[PDB]
Ligand SMILES: Nc1nc2c(ncn2[C@@H]2O[C@H](COP(=O)(O)OP(=O)(O)O)[C@@H](O)[C@H]2O)c(=O)[nH]1
Ligand SMILES: CN(C)Cc1[nH]c2ccccc2c1[C@H]1NC(=O)c2ccc(O)cc21
Ligand SMILES: CN(C)Cc1[nH]c2ccccc2c1[C@H]1NC(=O)c2ccc(O)cc21
Ligand SMILES: [Mg+2]
């Protein structure tokens with residue numbers, strides 16, 4: 001089967017662990033150790049293709065997992081303006097490490113269930129447009145958009161390999 005190495009990046013507290021646990025274990029984790037960096041495997045069928053996902057949940061970071069990673073979920077929280085601005089730091093570090101401007105990535109606006117929005121969908125669509133990448137809103141709490149974010153990332157890696 002086809003293997004895909006995904007990296008979940010973003011500021012502390014955006015929901016990287018909650019998003020990873022929601023996809024892997026189908027449950028919402030309200031308090032996961034913020035310093036723990038782990039990897040998870042999941043066998044899934046995406047567009048009729050049996051895939052093995054090797055997902056790294058980062059805890060922030062180093063050029064090494066950026067070298068290994070084939071696709072990046074760049075996560076910010078819709079109630080945290082600083083986490084949205086932090087996206088560019090990850091983008092630029094990934095770009096330098098990979099020596100490329102077309103690295104598979106998806107911009108994720110997590111905590112979409114929260115009414116305390118400080119990042120508008122237009123700000124985020126403008127950011128995603130500038131990078132030339134998809135923008136997906138998610139809620140690791142309700143599961144809304146979780147599969148769409150991770151599977152769009154797989155589809156992006158598949159497209160990149162295909163050219
Ligand atoms: N309301 C809401 N809370 C979330 C969501 N995702 C994560 N959280 C909470 O945000 C906090 C930080 O999440 P965590 O997954 O540890 O973030 P990380 O540091 O990026 O891994 C925890 O208290 C989570 O329960 C979400 O989509 N909605
Ligand atoms: C059973 N198939 C339906 C699987 C499937 N679903 C897709 C959806 C979008 C794009 C391609 C595909 C493929 C394959 N067809 C390809 O050209 C290709 C290239 C690399 C792969 O890893 C997989 C595929
Ligand atoms: C090999 N897999 C079973 C684990 C795993 N899954 C990944 C998905 C995307 C990117 C990297 C990885 C890795 C590791 N390979 C690394 O280079 C690295 C650096 C730091 C880590 O914490 C983990 C890894
Ligand atoms: Mg975490």
Ligand SMILES: [Mg+2]
Nearest residue numbers: 081118119120
């Ligand atoms: Mg403002």
